[PDB]
């Protein structure tokens, strides 16, 4: 947690997360889990209409502070 980003769900809910610029995607999904009770294996995150992959960092996708991630559930 060094910067702030927002995660958007299809219901219209906005989730505020505190993240490190070098956080892996699954660490972002982990933060979403211990805040929304949603298993990371159900989470699918999009940025600029591209799915974010486990193992890659936020900085790999040029995701900076106050950015918006979009969350769609698999099932």
């Amino acid at each position: 947690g060094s910067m702030q980003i927002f995660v958007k769900t299809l219901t219209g809910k906005t989730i505020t997360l505190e993240v490190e610029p070098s956080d892996t995607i699954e660490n972002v999904k982990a933060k979403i889990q211990d805040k929304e009770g949603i298993p990371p294996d159900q989470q699918k995150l999009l940025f600029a209409r591209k799915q974010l992959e486990d193992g890659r960092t936020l900085s790999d996708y040029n995701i900076h502070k106050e950015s918006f991630l979009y969350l769609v559930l698999r099932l």
Binding site: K8, T9, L10, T11, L46, R49, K50, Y70, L75
Partner: protein, 217 residues
């Protein structure tokens, strides 16, 4: 008929007697918030057929909510047309939809309403139009929903592949679009999302992999 489009209203006791002991507890978790169950045919049209019956059935007890649902639904045809749809293509689907609303307005029995939902032509014409409403809203709000759809397809291409065709089962993007297009709130239980967020759910559904059923409190 062993496989009707919409079944009779039942008690959820037939959820044990369909099943795995880890699943047995969550029905008790469900029996404390839901008393009854109505089933739809698992054909990929479950969500729309479940929603359609649940709301129309509820409107028998609310004349004033019926009137605005009727007003929204009546305008919806020309509304789809203005945004690219062919009036002549969607005409009869919309009319069957308005026809069911009129039946509810004239206080049709619940038994007769169920019969209409079990007529293949009538019940599927309904689902077709609900899919067109959903697709119409998605394309209309393409800027919003683009964020949730992976690159490679426009919202329109997504609609023509995943929403408009029959047999295509619904997920969260279908539910929010229909809930916003018709301005009625929907809550889904699994085996608790509210569409849209921060609203009071009027339609209660149960979701099992690729299938939706109607829940009653």
């Amino acid at each position: 008929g062993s496989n009707p489009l919409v079944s009779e209203r039942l008690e959820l006791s037939v959820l044990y007697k369909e099943y795995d002991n880890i699943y047995q507890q969550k029905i008790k978790d469900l029996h404390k918030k839901y008393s009854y169950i109505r089933k739809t045919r698992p054909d990929g049209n479950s969500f729309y057929r479940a929603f359609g019956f649940s709301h129309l059935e509820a409107l028998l007890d609310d004349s004033k909510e019926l009137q605005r649902f009727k007003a929204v639904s009546a305008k919806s045809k020309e509304d789809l047309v203005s945004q690219g749809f062919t009036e002549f293509t969607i005409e009869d689907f919309h009319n069957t939809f308005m026809d069911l609303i009129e039946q509810v307005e004239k206080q049709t029995s619940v038994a007769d309403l169920l019969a209409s939902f079990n007529d293949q032509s009538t019940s599927d014409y309904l689902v077709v139009y609900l899919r067109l409403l959903t697709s119409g809203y998605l394309q209309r709000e393409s800027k919003f929903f683009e964020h949730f759809i992976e690159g490679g397809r426009t919202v329109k291409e997504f609609c023509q592949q995943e929403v408009e065709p029959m047999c295509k089962e619904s997920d969260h993007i279908h539910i929010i679009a229909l809930a916003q297009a018709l301005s009625v709130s929907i809550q889904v239980e699994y085996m608790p999302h509210i569409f849209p967020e921060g609203s009071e759910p009027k339609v209660y559904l149960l979701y099992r992999p690729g299938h939706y059923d109607i829940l009653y409190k």
